[PDB]
Design a protein around this motif. Structure first.
Motif, PDB file in Angstrom:
ATOM      1  N   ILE A   1      11.682 -20.934  95.602  1.00  0.00           N
ATOM      2  CA  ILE A   1      11.927 -20.777  97.033  1.00  0.00           C
ATOM      3  C   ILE A   1      12.838 -21.928  97.506  1.00  0.00           C
ATOM      4  N   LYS A   2      13.924 -21.558  98.185  1.00  0.00           N
ATOM      5  CA  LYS A   2      14.875 -22.437  98.803  1.00  0.00           C
ATOM      6  C   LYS A   2      14.703 -22.735 100.290  1.00  0.00           C
ATOM      7  N   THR A   3      14.107 -21.839 101.009  1.00  0.00           N
ATOM      8  CA  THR A   3      13.935 -22.009 102.447  1.00  0.00           C
ATOM      9  C   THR A   3      12.559 -21.474 102.787  1.00  0.00           C
ATOM     10  N   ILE A   4      11.842 -22.194 103.637  1.00  0.00           N
ATOM     11  CA  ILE A   4      10.453 -21.875 103.929  1.00  0.00           C
ATOM     12  C   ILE A   4      10.170 -22.192 105.392  1.00  0.00           C
ATOM     13  N   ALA A   5       9.452 -21.294 106.066  1.00  0.00           N
ATOM     14  CA  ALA A   5       9.166 -21.384 107.487  1.00  0.00           C
ATOM     15  C   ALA A   5       7.667 -21.544 107.683  1.00  0.00           C
ATOM     16  N   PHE A   6       7.295 -22.545 108.419  1.00  0.00           N
ATOM     17  CA  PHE A   6       5.921 -22.863 108.755  1.00  0.00           C
ATOM     18  C   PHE A   6       5.657 -22.629 110.241  1.00  0.00           C
ATOM     19  N   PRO A   7       4.541 -22.052 110.597  1.00  0.00           N
ATOM     20  CA  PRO A   7       4.058 -22.175 111.970  1.00  0.00           C
ATOM     21  C   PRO A   7       3.415 -23.529 112.164  1.00  0.00           C
ATOM     22  N   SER A   8       2.816 -23.757 113.326  1.00  0.00           N
ATOM     23  CA  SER A   8       1.969 -24.924 113.513  1.00  0.00           C
ATOM     24  C   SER A   8       0.635 -24.691 112.813  1.00  0.00           C
ATOM     25  N   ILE A   9       0.361 -25.464 111.764  1.00  0.00           N
ATOM     26  CA  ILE A   9      -0.868 -25.309 110.989  1.00  0.00           C
ATOM     27  C   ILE A   9      -1.906 -26.298 111.475  1.00  0.00           C
ATOM     28  N   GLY A  10      -3.158 -25.857 111.534  1.00  0.00           N
ATOM     29  CA  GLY A  10      -4.274 -26.751 111.720  1.00  0.00           C
ATOM     30  C   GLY A  10      -4.713 -26.870 113.157  1.00  0.00           C
ATOM     31  N   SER A  11      -3.804 -26.640 114.083  1.00  0.00           N
ATOM     32  CA  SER A  11      -4.132 -26.548 115.486  1.00  0.00           C
ATOM     33  C   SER A  11      -4.422 -25.093 115.803  1.00  0.00           C
ATOM     34  N   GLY A  12      -5.427 -24.870 116.633  1.00  0.00           N
ATOM     35  CA  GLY A  12      -5.968 -23.536 116.771  1.00  0.00           C
ATOM     36  C   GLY A  12      -7.356 -23.500 116.173  1.00  0.00           C
ATOM     37  N   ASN A  13      -7.688 -22.419 115.453  1.00  0.00           N
ATOM     38  CA  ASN A  13      -9.055 -22.226 114.969  1.00  0.00           C
ATOM     39  C   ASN A  13      -9.549 -23.388 114.114  1.00  0.00           C
ATOM     40  N   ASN A  14      -8.649 -24.109 113.443  1.00  0.00           N
ATOM     41  CA  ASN A  14      -9.101 -25.205 112.603  1.00  0.00           C
ATOM     42  C   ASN A  14      -9.336 -26.481 113.401  1.00  0.00           C
ATOM     43  N   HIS A  15      -8.847 -26.523 114.639  1.00  0.00           N
ATOM     44  CA  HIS A  15      -9.229 -27.502 115.653  1.00  0.00           C
ATOM     45  C   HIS A  15      -8.649 -28.891 115.430  1.00  0.00           C
ATOM     46  N   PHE A  16      -7.635 -29.060 114.582  1.00  0.00           N
ATOM     47  CA  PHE A  16      -7.001 -30.370 114.485  1.00  0.00           C
ATOM     48  C   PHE A  16      -6.280 -30.697 115.794  1.00  0.00           C
ATOM     49  N   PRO A  17      -6.406 -31.920 116.296  1.00  0.00           N
ATOM     50  CA  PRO A  17      -5.542 -32.348 117.406  1.00  0.00           C
ATOM     51  C   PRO A  17      -4.092 -32.183 116.995  1.00  0.00           C
ATOM     52  N   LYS A  18      -3.225 -31.852 117.959  1.00  0.00           N
ATOM     53  CA  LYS A  18      -1.884 -31.432 117.551  1.00  0.00           C
ATOM     54  C   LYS A  18      -1.106 -32.557 116.896  1.00  0.00           C
ATOM     55  N   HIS A  19      -1.159 -33.763 117.462  1.00  0.00           N
ATOM     56  CA  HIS A  19      -0.373 -34.841 116.888  1.00  0.00           C
ATOM     57  C   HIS A  19      -0.874 -35.209 115.502  1.00  0.00           C
ATOM     58  N   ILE A  20      -2.193 -35.286 115.312  1.00  0.00           N
ATOM     59  CA  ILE A  20      -2.733 -35.610 113.997  1.00  0.00           C
ATOM     60  C   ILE A  20      -2.306 -34.567 112.969  1.00  0.00           C
ATOM     61  N   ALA A  21      -2.348 -33.290 113.346  1.00  0.00           N
ATOM     62  CA  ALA A  21      -1.935 -32.244 112.420  1.00  0.00           C
ATOM     63  C   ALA A  21      -0.466 -32.364 112.063  1.00  0.00           C
ATOM     64  N   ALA A  22       0.392 -32.531 113.064  1.00  0.00           N
ATOM     65  CA  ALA A  22       1.823 -32.621 112.783  1.00  0.00           C
ATOM     66  C   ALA A  22       2.137 -33.837 111.914  1.00  0.00           C
ATOM     67  N   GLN A  23       1.564 -34.996 112.247  1.00  0.00           N
ATOM     68  CA  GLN A  23       1.779 -36.191 111.441  1.00  0.00           C
ATOM     69  C   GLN A  23       1.384 -35.942 109.996  1.00  0.00           C
ATOM     70  N   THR A  24       0.194 -35.373 109.803  1.00  0.00           N
ATOM     71  CA  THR A  24      -0.321 -35.163 108.456  1.00  0.00           C
ATOM     72  C   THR A  24       0.604 -34.242 107.673  1.00  0.00           C
ATOM     73  N   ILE A  25       1.032 -33.157 108.322  1.00  0.00           N
ATOM     74  CA  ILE A  25       1.859 -32.155 107.661  1.00  0.00           C
ATOM     75  C   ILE A  25       3.229 -32.725 107.338  1.00  0.00           C
ATOM     76  N   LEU A  26       3.871 -33.377 108.315  1.00  0.00           N
ATOM     77  CA  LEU A  26       5.224 -33.878 108.073  1.00  0.00           C
ATOM     78  C   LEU A  26       5.212 -34.965 107.009  1.00  0.00           C
ATOM     79  N   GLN A  27       4.198 -35.842 107.034  1.00  0.00           N
ATOM     80  CA  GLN A  27       4.108 -36.893 106.022  1.00  0.00           C
ATOM     81  C   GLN A  27       3.842 -36.307 104.640  1.00  0.00           C
ATOM     82  N   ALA A  28       3.067 -35.228 104.570  1.00  0.00           N
ATOM     83  CA  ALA A  28       2.808 -34.568 103.299  1.00  0.00           C
ATOM     84  C   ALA A  28       4.085 -33.984 102.722  1.00  0.00           C
ATOM     85  N   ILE A  29       4.937 -33.418 103.580  1.00  0.00           N
ATOM     86  CA  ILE A  29       6.204 -32.866 103.109  1.00  0.00           C
ATOM     87  C   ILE A  29       7.129 -33.980 102.626  1.00  0.00           C
TER      88      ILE A  29
END
Length: 189
Positions: A125-153
């Motif tokens: 895979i060369k190109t990949i699209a993500f929604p906002s993960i973890g916010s919503g039913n999984n209940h992560f605060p939005k900033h914590i989720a985004a930080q975690t995801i972007l740092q993981a990438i």
């Protein structure tokens, strides 16, 4: 149909480019879209319902067969199916953790993202699209989720010899989540 706006773009150290985009995840023409789901791989909620609507009922057969062969999708793990009527070729299903009052919740989210990217590489895979993960039913605060995801990438691309993945799109439907991702991308390198 609706179109897209690119609110931010940033290239990481070794040349992979992340984008914060406003639009409909199911309208992006890319190699893969990410479907956050549970152990039974259900299509539930705003994002999951839209993916299923756009992919068509054909995806149900493939997901049901996947579970016949592979059982449930364990937490943090990923699985790929075809996108059917989606304009993207593959769906990367991921079982994200729920937020909990423990550092283990962010660790598990990091591993979810790492596992999704690793599996995507197996398909070249060369190109990949993500929604906002973890916010919503999984209940992560939005900033914590985004930080975690972007740092993981960012960390993923610095932890492998090479990757097929050249572009990652965060396709967000609300200004609040756009603002969160725009802010955290500044700290992602």
């Amino acid at each position: 149909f609706q179109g897209f706006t690119i609110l931010s773009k940033k290239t990481l150290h070794l040349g992979q480019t992340l984008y914060v985009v406003n639009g409909d995840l199911t309208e992006v023409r890319c190699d893969a879209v990410v479907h956050p789901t549970n152990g039974t791989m259900s299509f539930a909620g705003q994002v999951g319902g839209a993916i299923r609507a756009a992919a068509g009922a054909g995806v149900d057969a493939e997901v049901n067969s996947y579970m016949s062969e592979h059982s449930q999708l364990q937490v943090t793990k990923a699985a790929i199916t075809s996108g059917h009527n989606l304009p993207s070729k593959w769906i990367v299903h991921v079982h994200s953790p729920n937020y909990s009052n423990a550092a283990t919740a962010t660790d598990a989210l990091t591993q979810t993202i790492r596992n999704a990217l690793t599996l995507a590489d197996t398909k070249s895979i060369k190109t990949i699209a993500f929604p906002s993960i973890g916010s919503g039913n999984n209940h992560f605060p939005k900033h914590i989720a985004a930080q975690t995801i972007l740092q993981a990438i960012s960390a993923y691309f610095m932890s492998i010899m090479s990757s097929s993945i050249k572009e990652v799109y965060f396709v967000l439907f609300d200004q609040e989540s756009i603002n969160v991702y725009n802010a955290e991308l500044i700290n992602t390198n």
